[PDB]
Amino acid sequence: KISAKANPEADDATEIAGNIVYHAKYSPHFSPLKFGPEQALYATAESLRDRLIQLWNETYVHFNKVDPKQTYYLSMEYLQGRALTNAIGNLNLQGPYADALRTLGYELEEIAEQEKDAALGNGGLGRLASCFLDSMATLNLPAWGYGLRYRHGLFKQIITKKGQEEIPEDWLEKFSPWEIVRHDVVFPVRFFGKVQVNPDGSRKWVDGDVVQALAYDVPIPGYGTKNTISLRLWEAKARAEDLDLFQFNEGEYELAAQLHSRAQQICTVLYPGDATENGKLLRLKQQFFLCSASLQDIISRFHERSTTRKWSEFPSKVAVQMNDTHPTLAIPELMRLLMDDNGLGWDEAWDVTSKTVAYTNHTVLPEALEKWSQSLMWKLLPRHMEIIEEIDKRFVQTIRDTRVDLEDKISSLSILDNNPQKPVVRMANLCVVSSHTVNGVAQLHSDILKAELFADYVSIWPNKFQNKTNGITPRRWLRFCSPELSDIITKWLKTDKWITDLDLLTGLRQFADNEELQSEWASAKTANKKRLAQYIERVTGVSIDPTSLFDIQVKRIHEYKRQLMNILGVVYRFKKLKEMKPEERKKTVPRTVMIGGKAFATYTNAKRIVKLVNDVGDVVNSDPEVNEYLKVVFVPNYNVTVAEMLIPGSELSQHISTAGMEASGTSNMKFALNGCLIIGTLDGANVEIREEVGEENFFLFGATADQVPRLRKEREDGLFKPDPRFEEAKQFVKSGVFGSYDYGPLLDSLEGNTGFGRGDYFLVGYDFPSYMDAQAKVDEAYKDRKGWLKMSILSTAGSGKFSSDRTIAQYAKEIWNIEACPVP
Amino acid sequence: KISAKANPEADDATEIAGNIVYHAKYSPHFSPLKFGPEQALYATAESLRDRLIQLWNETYVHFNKVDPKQTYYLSMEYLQGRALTNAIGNLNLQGPYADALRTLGYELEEIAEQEKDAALGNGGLGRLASCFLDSMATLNLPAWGYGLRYRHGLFKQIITKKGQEEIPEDWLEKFSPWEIVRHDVVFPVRFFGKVQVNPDGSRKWVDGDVVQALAYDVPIPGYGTKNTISLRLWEAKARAEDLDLFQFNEGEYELAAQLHSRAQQICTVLYPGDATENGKLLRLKQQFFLCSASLQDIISRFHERSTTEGSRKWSEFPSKVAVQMNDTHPTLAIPELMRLLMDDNGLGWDEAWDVTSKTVAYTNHTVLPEALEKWSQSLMWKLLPRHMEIIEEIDKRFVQTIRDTRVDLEDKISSLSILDNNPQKPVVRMANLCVVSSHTVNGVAQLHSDILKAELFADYVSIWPNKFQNKTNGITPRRWLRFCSPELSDIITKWLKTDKWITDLDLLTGLRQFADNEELQSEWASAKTANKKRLAQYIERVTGVSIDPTSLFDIQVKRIHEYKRQLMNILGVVYRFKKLKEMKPEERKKTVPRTVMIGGKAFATYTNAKRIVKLVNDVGDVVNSDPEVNEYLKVVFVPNYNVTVAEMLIPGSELSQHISTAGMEASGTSNMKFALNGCLIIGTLDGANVEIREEVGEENFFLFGATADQVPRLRKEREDGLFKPDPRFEEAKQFVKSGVFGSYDYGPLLDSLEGNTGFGRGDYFLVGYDFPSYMDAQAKVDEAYKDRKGWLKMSILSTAGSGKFSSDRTIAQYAKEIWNIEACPVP
Ligand SMILES: C[C@H]1O[C@H](O[C@H]2[C@H](O)[C@@H](O)[C@@H](O[C@H]3[C@H](O)[C@@H](O)[C@H](O)O[C@@H]3CO)O[C@@H]2CO)[C@H](O)[C@@H](O)[C@@H]1N[C@H]1C=C(CO)[C@@H](O)[C@H](O)[C@H]1O
Ligand SMILES: *Cc1c(COP(=O)(O)O)cnc(C)c1O
Ligand SMILES: *Cc1c(COP(=O)(O)O)cnc(C)c1O
Ligand SMILES: OC[C@H]1O[C@H](O)[C@H](O)[C@@H](O)[C@@H]1O
Ligand SMILES: OC[C@H]1O[C@H](O)[C@H](O)[C@@H](O)[C@@H]1O
């Protein structure tokens, strides 16, 4: 019926349908006869990519001409999610694309559901990086991300009757229609080898292995702007020359291909397991490979913008941001590139380096900061060790010169820990010593950093440390995932400028009590809940009641996130329902509980928690007697797509980490922004949300951070007195009512008073009573519909501050010193 | 200045330039700023591929609707060469594309020189298969090729001070703009494992390793027709699921990825080295994988063309399908088709065998009986157990036949049967499996096919006297005259007063009446001269030697092998050099200057072949740098011989050498290319030389050497001490051993020409014996070349006689006598 007709700039239904069909025909990846959903997606995605290329190229040419200071963000993860809807939306072509697909016999949703998530990351570190990219593009900032092109991600989670099983991700097994290979953009990265000392006394890293880094671009479109930036990803490749024919033809296939294998290894998965020496080396290879490829690419661009250049311009034209310690090696690597490849002296090269690099810490934990064996570092990266050692030797001399009062502390301040048992390189110390700025990711976290963790460094450089509170993008996380709700907002604010000025959401406050608005809000939530119900049946075969309360905990499965507390809470509520007469049951609040997330494969108890949730759900959900009032579901393969289906339908979300353990929590913000109320500890980003939405719209409970040490010491000393409901939940789990699986060894982590891996270190038992009492409040509040709806609107109305646009603007001004560079 | 504008059907300069620029922008593989030659090529190739897709899709739809009998050709090699010029040319868009590129600031030649050869094959077996594809397309026949998508080819040859070194090919390290991946066309292929026997007596191959075969299409356009067929290539892949995360995360990387590694192995190189057991298994994996993937794809298409009820009746299968096995490599298609019919599709043995026997036909390309593939029964059981069961049942029935209807052949059963149950090295004789199973067996030249009926397969000819046939090899006149020699092709069209020869090559005979015409000779001289300048230019570019375009161009290019007698040639050269050093300058001015060019590749493990390449180079270093004789002689080794190289050498050639020991060559298609481009041959009465010489006429050909029937006798004279060597032959040897060509000891190589008996010695290939009649034929060539009119006359009659050597003739014969297929033109 419809005719192929290329129109790379199509912007109406007919043009778009012609261009989609053009790509179906003349960019084929399949037999021509069938044009089913999958072929439609790739066709549509190529239609959009025509737009994206035009804009990316314009933006590249513009930054080239203006030669502004440019920021480059280094991260080991990016959670890009699906790109289709975000691209349609930033190009403001929703109506036209939807019409185009219908003329081709498809609903956009249908096609959207075919797309795979780019498995390029894992946690909030990666989603932060991605929301930042969106904000850089929309604020017209000259900034890019650089990452690694992982083939298989961390893993795809399957749920079998044995619990979580891990299988590789396949998002590249056919092809990805977003990315643009650049076969001219290749840089060599070395490993192992040694340092040649030249007769003139210059130095050179030689020998070892050389791999090739190949650039692919993923364009990132901004909202209401031509500016389209890049997430540039690196693939490690061997050259064809590196296959040894002689050995292949001798039948020795692994030796023959061993350079190709070492390359493949680097982009196989995120965070490869590192109990062994091999894995530790592979991790370091990953980190180095990203730093070295990216910095060579950055230096190459610095020179390309020359209009004949002097190095002293470098930190006025470049800013590099290290996200956690993973890209620490950018420090010595930049030093290597300056002194060896470009001939600079130490002092000049260090001045440049120190003013270019800045460091973002995301961790409350003292021992979670990366430390590497000095022995491994010498083996893998000998030139970098020389440089790292000279950095430490000068810094220690500074402390003897300028600060004799810290002499006794040199053995913890220095970068090199020369402990005779486990000598290591302390990477956070290298970051802090070298960067012009260090920031944390929430006001409390940043204060802990200045006061406890990095106290003495704050002392030497009192202007080095800063705060930059995390945020989210309101495009992906409200405008695009919750379009019904966004229309309501635009109607009642009488503008749509909130989509780039999120503080305008405070205008909703005056309407929180308004009956018509609450009625509209109920309907949108009800409609988003039907959809979520649908999805849940589709992906777990469980039929959930849309009129019940939707209570959601989705995040990495970890003892400190206290999924176990949640799930024991559920066991308790279930027991009490079985024990009630039917007349008492009709008075409780029906609830559907939803838990999701992934456990590290080797993390035994995390894997036992996932198993537990499922076993509970099998029994609870199939009990005709109480399944009207309670259901429990494990949502599998939690990722961006899943979050996009859960958040708009959520009513209560649980952010209940042990106080002091979380530096932030951006999912918190997504929930708050979509009118979902929180039950939470006064921890991380909960502190800021609760300030912004108001205490009365938030279910606080649990010990506070300053209290926790004291409460552990009470446990060590036999003074802890457990609540009987806590013990009743445990026993009931041990009674074997949830099947043959012995949960005793899991529950053992909550027994005893002292010793590694027991003694309830995360205060599950202790917070259970105030947790369950906050849950009773949530039940009472939910029965008062007007009050509930009021709280939900004030939740959204207070979410202004949590925009990634605010965060990036702050970074741009105080740290990077970059400014808007709009493409005409 | 020019704007992107998609026009998938561009057919004039302006439209084409717009579409090329569209692809530079919206199909990028590079940073956007620079639009240099490389980017221009990929951009131009994608413009052409738009046309190619439209025509391929039309052809697929047409064959689907008509449901004709379809031929599928199975080959382990294809020498596709560069595609750019062939595509422009078959679409008849030379003028428009050349103009388009000039508006973009490029000469087409410049861009064409950027393209890499598709390293999908090695020798004449593969180029035959490719020329056949071009002819299938141009005759509008419903036929396809199926092969393997090799990443690294055989190897790229470099020449170092050590001689030949082998490095992997890189033609896929960026990407290939011709091919079309088909992600819905995936079929599973198994290895190892075992046979489950079901209670109902049905059988099923289970367990082992499973790899995925993924189809990529390379469209093949026909000349002056819409018909565009496929070379469908298979890539072996493992699924993502097959990587073991647990092991990867334990640091055990090789185990973790072992299934991916076994898949990458299959498509790494052509003819992987097989001294070891691992290599033998890998070779068999390659062969099986091509047969099983391709047959599944074929069966799927047979069913897809059903218009009816349920599944269509199997008895139609051999009326709708023909499968051609090229050499013994794809023998496994016999038991595999049997496996698919009986196990997956439930047919009984007899019905399945009737189908199978009428579907498959076999082409032999090999004179010697110890080049035909034999495999250890033990390896076959390991790798392909179900196939062994079936192969065994085939042999059990064939032997019973020879008792139930031919009791007179009882005493020969132990050499006729498929299974050789020798107590030391029991093997499966694959040629015997082919001959027992196929409705037709053919050779590739009239003499070769007669040797097959009379010597090699005599007793099989006895049982099935209509089974055996001849099909003389040929070449495509599109790639090999019209497109490589365009100046010359215009002359031909002008004097024949038509251009219909490009698809009716026999019209070339119309040139004969003009062979004595001085205007035509004058035009011919110019065209050769011009082609020779170009060759001279290329040779400097790739060797660093400056050659004289006025000297005689004498070329031997083919696989380096003792039986091809590059060593004879090279010793001839050493002789001529010695004589030139020994002359006074007055005697030198009377000889005919000559540039000798030798090229080809040695199998990496073949010691003497590698020594010969070393020898040629060492001789050239010394000769070419000698001021005293380099005006009169130069010797050059042309590296990395492939289709591109042949395309540069053939149009500029004057004499070419096809001098194999008589009886050893079944054919020789390069012979034909040379003859077709007016290049005269110095050759033995062997393979295709017999036929060329008949066709061009004896007076236009430099024959020499012993004949096939004489060779045994001449070996027996050597074994008995009766051989009396020519003194010029010994003078050449000694001079090579005197160390005038450097420090390399050539004694062990030359040892192959010494002694009278014993494995690897005694001059088995009669180098020494043919040397005098060879060198005398070389003196004739010198005299004939001095008479320019007579030379030009011979060259024209060479071209004028090349009619019979068209691949169009060969494929038409195959279509009628073997496949029983016919023209199916796309409207
Ligand atoms: C008629 C029969 O044909 C096929 O049987 C083949 C085997 O597939 C093949 O492996 C080979 O088997 C030999 C086997 O490997 C060996 O170990 C055993 O000792 O002897 C076998 C014979 O030498 O050859 C046989 C037969 O020549 C199919 O696999 C069978 O399914 C098929 N049987 C059909 C036919 C009928 C009626 O005609 C049904 O009664 C029967 O249930 C059905 O399976
Ligand atoms: C936002 C997000 C995260 C990070 O959230 P935290 O609970 O705050 O650590 C992780 N996964 C997905 C899929 C997300 O969208
Ligand atoms: C035609 C061709 C061959 C054919 O084989 P011969 O044995 O020379 O006749 C081999 N290689 C190339 C590159 C060819 O074009
Ligand atoms: O959750 C992600 C974490 O997992 C692993 O245990 C890594 O050692 C750590 O680097 C990473 O941040
Ligand atoms: O409880 C904290 C730690 O304990 C266990 O050793 C887990 O395997 C580890 O990944 C986790 O982070």
Ligand SMILES: OC[C@H]1O[C@H](O)[C@H](O)[C@@H](O)[C@@H]1O
């Ligand atoms: O080059 C063609 C031939 O080369 C090798 O000698 C192989 O062993 C053989 O299988 C192949 O046919």
